[PDB]
């Protein structure tokens, strides 16, 4: 019995270490000052915020974080409402065409982005829509639609089928029946689709690096990748690791709070419990 207990205690520690070593490296690299930047993963020198108090000094990264948050919120809202429409369409009713829509919603999920940003960067150079929040929300909500459709069609096939009839038999007008029987039953689906679409559309580097050029509407990953030749030069290691940590904190928060539903939404409602 001790054999299996040890072999289940040494395989979970393995997974957690595998998953949290290259994040704790970012953390221990960004916490150390511009001294003892030599080897050591256990924070050799004393922690001092000699990098965070420098990255947030000026309009270099603060604006690049505000643009990221705003773009992410707009794209998750719009992509969730559009994917909810499409998911309720492909979930219960539409007979004529529910088999090629789920083919396009995979062709654009496996679509090489570079196969698309060579023409767009030309097109969106003429309309004037070069570097603005309109000019990034469109491709973000284009590529974030398959994820929303997936994780929402899951929860939409999840809810039972006789609710509409049991609502219309009590006297409910279809609008009343919908807004009083199905709307509160599809709120967890919408919130988890919003979480997933934000986590997705919040990390795209190729689009934001190809289209955006100025401090207006320049996402945060592009700013991090530009910390190399920017003013931030007390040593690029501290500033870059600090930006990477400030970025990766929201994902840690989201997972630590909502893993119970994120797993059930990613696995298409199959590991609920």
């Amino acid at each position: 019995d001790a054999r299996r207990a040890t072999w289940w205690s040494v395989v979970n520690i393995l997974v957690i270490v595998y998953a949290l070593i290259p994040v704790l490296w970012i953390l221990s690299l960004s916490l150390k000052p511009t001294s003892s930047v030599k080897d050591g993963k256990l924070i050799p020198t004393e922690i001092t915020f000699a990098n965070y108090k420098a990255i947030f000094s000026g309009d270099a990264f603060t604006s690049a974080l505000f643009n990221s948050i705003g773009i992410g919120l707009i794209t998750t809202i719009i992509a969730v409402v559009i994917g909810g429409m499409a998911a309720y369409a492909v979930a219960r009713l539409q007979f004529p065409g529910k088999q090629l829509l789920i083919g396009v919603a995979l062709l654009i999920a496996m679509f090489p982005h570079i196969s698309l940003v060579t023409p767009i960067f030309n097109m969106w150079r003429g309309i004037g829509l070069f570097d603005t929040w309109p000019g990034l929300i469109i491709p973000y909500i284009t590529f974030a639609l398959p994820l929303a459709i997936y994780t929402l069609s899951a929860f939409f096939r999840e809810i039972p089928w006789d609710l509409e009839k049991a609502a219309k038999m009590d006297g409910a007008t279809p609008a009343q029946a919908f807004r009083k029987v199905i709307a509160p039953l599809a709120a967890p689906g919408i919130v988890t689709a919003a979480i997933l679409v934000f986590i997705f559309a919040w990390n795209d580097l190729l689009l934001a690096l190809s289209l955006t050029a100025t401090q207006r509407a320049i996402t945060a990953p592009v700013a991090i990748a530009n910390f190399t030749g920017s003013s931030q030069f007390e040593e690029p290691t501290g500033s870059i690791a600090a930006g990477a940590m400030v970025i990766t904190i929201p994902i840690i928060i989201f997972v630590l709070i909502f893993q119970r539903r994120i797993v059930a939404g990613l696995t298409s409602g199959a590991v609920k419990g």
């Binding site: 290259p22 994040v23 919040w202 990390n203 580097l205 991090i224 990748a225 970025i247 990766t248 994902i251």
Partner: peptide, 9 residues
């Protein structure tokens, strides 16, 4: 955790 982490960090 590594699924949602940004691919630049």
């Amino acid at each position: 955790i590594p699924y949602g982490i940004v691919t630049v960090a």
